[PDB]
Copies of this chain bind each other. A is one copy, B any other.
Amino acid sequence: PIFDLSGRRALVTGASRGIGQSIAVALAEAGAHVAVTARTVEGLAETRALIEKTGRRAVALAQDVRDVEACASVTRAAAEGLGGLDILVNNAGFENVRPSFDVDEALWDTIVSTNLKGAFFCAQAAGRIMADANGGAIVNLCSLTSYVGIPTAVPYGASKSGLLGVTRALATEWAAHNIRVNAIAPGYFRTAMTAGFYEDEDWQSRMLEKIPQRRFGKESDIGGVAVFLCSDAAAYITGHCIPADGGYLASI
């Protein structure tokens, strides 16, 4: 019962694949009715089918989190489709590496709008709905770059470090509305390591030596973390970021 989400209503952004898909499905498996977004509705087909496998309802909507209007209207539409809204997972994110001397304005904007600004304005919209009803839980997807710096991932790291600041300030501000706000910093997860960058085997060997568990994360390594942060088991946890990283941050 303490981890059960039966009857909760969740929105998970950028949920067509990877982490967001894992989280969305795990929320449905724990009892929740789940709305999922992506750039196109058609890219959600696998996520929708995996959710409806649980028996629960899946709402699916188009959304670009860079459009501040769509952050609000598509969040309100998600609420209407579910009959309410008391869980938000801000997963949507643009990943990028680029030498910092070569970052132009446009790149900066695409990264920060998507990863930081978008999550704020989705939070604001879901928050207002939660505040008018009986509260809820928000989970932001941060990164190892909220704790350390990756060279050539400067705008990205700014984004995710900023989002951790957002997590703490919103937690403090919205506790009085019964809204908890927490974050997960995934380490290196197989399902997020699509980019050509990651096949470089010397890189892989080097990174694995920094991870005590000597493995990259599977979907089972994060879904339950998101359920936990949304559940009554986490009633006294707010403004906190749980790293799911196989021990990377703890390790020399």
Interchain Cβ contacts under 8 Å between A and B, 23 examples: A100-B124, A105-B121, A112-B116, A112-B117, A120-B155, A145-B252, A152-B173, A153-B169, A157-B165, A159-B165, A160-B165, A161-B164, A167-B250, A172-B212, A172-B247, A175-B246, A176-B214, A206-B209, A213-B236, A220-B235, A222-B236, A236-B246, A240-B242
Interface centre among A105, A163, A228 (most CB of B within 10 A): A228
CB within 8 Å for A157 and B149 given contacts A108-B120, A171-B250, A175-B247: no
Q: Which 5 A-B residue pairings sit nearest by Cβ, starting from the closest?
A: A239-B250, A161-B165, A224-B233, A149-B169, A149-B168
Counting CB contacts under 8 A, is A110 at the interface?
Answer: no
A-side interface residues, number (CB < 8 Å): 88
Chain B residues within an 8 Å CB radius of A250: 148-149, 167-168, 171-172, 238-240
Contact flags (1/0) for A199-234 with B, using CB distance below 8 Å? 000000010011011100110111111011001111
Question: Does A77 sit within 8 A of B, measured CB to CB?
Answer: no
Q: What is the predominant secondary structure among interface residues of chain A facing chain B?
A: helix
